[PDB]
Structure 1
Amino acid sequence: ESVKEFLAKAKEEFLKKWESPSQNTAQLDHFDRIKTLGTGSFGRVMLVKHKETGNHYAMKILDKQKVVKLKQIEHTLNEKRILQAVNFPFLVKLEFSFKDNSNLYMVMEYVPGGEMFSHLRRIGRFSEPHARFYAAQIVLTFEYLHSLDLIYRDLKPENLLIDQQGYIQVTDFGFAKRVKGRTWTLCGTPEYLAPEIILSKGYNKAVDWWALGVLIYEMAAGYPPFFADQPIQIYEKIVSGKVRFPSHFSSDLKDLLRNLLQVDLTKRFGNLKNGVNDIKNHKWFATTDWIAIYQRKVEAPFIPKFKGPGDTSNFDDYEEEEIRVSINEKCGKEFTEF
């Protein structure tokens, strides 16, 4: 009932900021570029330094013309609207945003530990305590997002950054949707798609709890529960609802996963009468202090190597391309609300 009051306050704050988003809170020549941290079909993310303060940030730069070309207008505007409106310990903070003739810019706190993905593939797999530490943060994050009627829809280790204290930061919301009932879009990453998405059903927030099962499985095993050479063959396995577990999985872990990786929506944990508490109260989470996780007081099992501010060792190396700003304004009408 402290959770009830907390979430109602959180929803009132979200909705005020959703209805009146912030705009145009810095400009490009306030920053020096340091390094490209990631590329993509219509954008890049760069490590930048704010000239006045010397603070480092991650700057996402989206080429408006490419956004239009790849049909990503709504997704791009939606991500920025979400980021400036949410507030939760495991969601990245949007510090500034602005646009010019060519690009949209979102400036976020720099998360120096990189994607969980790299750490998982390097180490092979996480122990169950290590996996549980990360899983608890996702459970709280989905409890928050779902209470705002936001379905996340692209959970995966790639989308989970690790901060300097070893805790998770979610940065991408390009597929999230505010949807109190059902929605229908085929979207996500093949390994993480819930069966009802593959089967072209109307679906709801229960897809996020299925994806948590896939994440917990892949963290604890080192590989996801359903894989194949091609996505079409991944989908056949997913909808079969046949899963095999490594022999080192505990009984508690297998029981939780049978209940998350549940094809039948009337039986999937997270979607039942008791909602999220079926997950929080499950034996695999018995040792979890949910409040201490929220308060970031639990000692993290893994701390990324960080040699100071602006260390980029946990990201891959990319070819540095120019940041061109056209003499002509591109796509002004499409992006007015950014």
Structure 2
Amino acid sequence: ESVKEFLAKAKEEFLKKWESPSQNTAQLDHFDRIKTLGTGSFGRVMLVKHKETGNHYAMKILDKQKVVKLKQIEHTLNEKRILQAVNFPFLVKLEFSFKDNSNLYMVMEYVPGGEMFSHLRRIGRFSEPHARFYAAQIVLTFEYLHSLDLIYRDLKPENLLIDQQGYIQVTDFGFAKRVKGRTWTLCGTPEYLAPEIILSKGYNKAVDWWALGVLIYEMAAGYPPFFADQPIQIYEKIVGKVRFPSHFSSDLKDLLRNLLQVDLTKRFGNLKNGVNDIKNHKWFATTDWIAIYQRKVEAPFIPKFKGGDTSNFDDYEEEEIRVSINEKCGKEFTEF
């Protein structure tokens, strides 16, 4: 009952920030560039150092022209607007944002541990306690996001960072949508799509609980439950024959049968008791939910701290950051 009050205040605060977003809280020459951490079809992520403070940040730089070319205006504006409005322990925080003639900039605290994806592929698979520790953080994060009527729709190890305490930071919010009924976009990453996203019928927040099932499976097995060479073939397998590795525990298989439940009216997380069917499942019996939320549980894995180290990121050709003399796509990004 005290949970209802906490989340009611959280929704009020979210909606106030959504309605009056922060804008223009730094500028590019406040930062020194150190290294490219990632590239994508319309932007880059840079390790930068704030000149005045010496603090390290991940700066996500989006090329406005490429965003427009690739039809990502609404998603990019949405990511920034969501990020500055949400507040939860396992969500990255937006420290600054601004724009110039060429680019949009979002500046987050640097997390040198990098992505869950790279740790998972290095180790192979996580033990069940290890996977459970991460899963519990996702469960709580979705309880929070769903209370705001947001569907997350972008869960995968690629969008999950491991911080210096060994806890999760969820990175990406372009796809997060307010949905109290149904929505219909074919949106997400193939291996993680619920059957009702692939099919033309509408879907709701239950797709996030399906995706949690996929994540737990991939964390525990080392590979996702439905895989193939091309997306169309992944979709066909999804639409529910799952096989479990023999090392999966009885409790883990039972949980996954109820999360990877094709019938969304039978899927855990989407029943009358909502998230509590998940929290009370036997696989989570050893999980101290409050202690996880408070980050008082000893993490199973702490990324080695090497001192601005980028050992957990790949190397990229370092290319210019060019700011045109002409303003590009001003009207489209006015609200950023």
TM-score range relative to shorter protein:
over 0.9
Pairwise CA distance, 1:64: 0.4
Pairwise CA distance, 1:224: 0.5
Distance 2:178 2:44 in 1: 26
Distance 1:335 1:124 in 2: 42
Q: Deviations over 1:246-282 (max 9, x none)?
A: 0000000000000000000110000000000000000
Distance 1:213 1:111 in 2: 26
RMSD, matched Cα = 0.6
Q: Deviations over 1:177-227 (max 9, x none)?
A: 111111000011110000001111110000000000000000000010001
When the two structures are superposed, what TM-score results if normalisation uses the length of structure 1? Answer: 0.99
SS at structure 2 position matched to 1:46:
strand
- The runs of at least 4 aligned residues of structure 1 exceeding 4 Å deviation read none
Distance 2:287 2:322 in 1: 49
Determine what percentage of the aligned residue pairs are the same residue: 100
Q: Deviations over 1:107-160 (max 9, x none)?
A: 111111011001001000000000000000000000000000110111000110
Q: Deviations over 1:12-35 (max 9, x none)?
A: 111110000000001000000000
Distance 1:92 1:154 in 2: 14
SS at structure 1 position matched to 2:59:
strand
Pairwise CA distance, 1:90: 0.3
- Size of the aligned set, in residue pairs, is 336
Q: Deviations over 1:67-87 (max 9, x none)?
A: 000000000000000000000
SS at structure 2 position matched to 1:135:
helix
SS at structure 2 position matched to 1:57:
strand
Distance 2:108 2:228 in 1: 36
Distance 2:116 2:158 in 1: 6
SS at structure 2 position matched to 1:85:
coil
Distance 1:156 1:141 in 2: 14
Pairwise CA distance, 1:47: 0.4
Q: Deviations over 1:282-329 (max 9, x none)?
A: 000000000000000000000001112x11111111001000000000
Pairwise CA distance, 1:176: 1.2
Distance 1:62 1:134 in 2: 29
Distance 1:67 1:250 in 2: 45
SS at structure 1 position matched to 2:187:
coil
Pairwise CA distance, 1:6: 0.8
Distance 2:26 2:223 in 1: 42
Residue ranges of structure 1 left out of the alignment (5+ in a row):
none
Distance 2:30 2:81 in 1: 23
Q: Deviations over 1:27-71 (max 9, x none)?
A: 000000000111000000000000001011110000000000000
Distance 2:66 2:77 in 1: 14
Distance 1:266 1:254 in 2: 19
Corresponding residue for residue 202 of structure 1: 202
Distance 1:165 1:7 in 2: 25
Pairwise CA distance, 1:230: 1.6
Distance 2:203 2:275 in 1: 18
Distance 1:22 1:236 in 2: 43
SS at structure 1 position matched to 2:95:
strand
